[PDB]
Design a protein around this ligand. Sequence first.
Ligand code: K3Y
Length: 152
Amino acid sequence: APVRSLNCTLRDSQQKSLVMSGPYELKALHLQGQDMEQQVVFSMSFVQGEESNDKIPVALGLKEKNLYLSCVLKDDKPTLQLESVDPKNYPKKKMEKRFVFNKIEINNKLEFESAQFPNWYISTSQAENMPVFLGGTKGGQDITDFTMQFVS
Ligand SMILES: Cn1cc(C(N)=O)c([C@@H]2CCCNC2)n1
């Protein structure tokens, strides 16, 4: 059958919202009021992959855009990128592994681990106006847990 998807927003556990910071970067900042329209709306697709009660493979596309969050090596390091795809072919149920995150329930919140790079997570910084990135160090003040808000 088709792939199933939900529209949603994400905020980090410090309650920063995610906005596009150019065509291919996301940044996290504290947002409230009129400026909340700036936040990115995701289409979260429920994709093929290893699954358990608390760990659900997803892709994170930008709603109304042929753009997906993507985990690749860049200058020999696992990195988060926004990658363009052929809009005729996406979303699909068998997304390529660079596009897959394991959405994990953690202490009433959500973590997004790279399926491609075990124990690398979608991360934000403490400071505002910094990129969303793929973090692979568990020590430090980087934020790896989020809440989801459902969108019409
Ligand atoms: C058509 N469209 C979809 C999205 C999105 N997936 O976030 C957008 C952004 C929303 C934030 C304001 N700029 C444009 N525009």
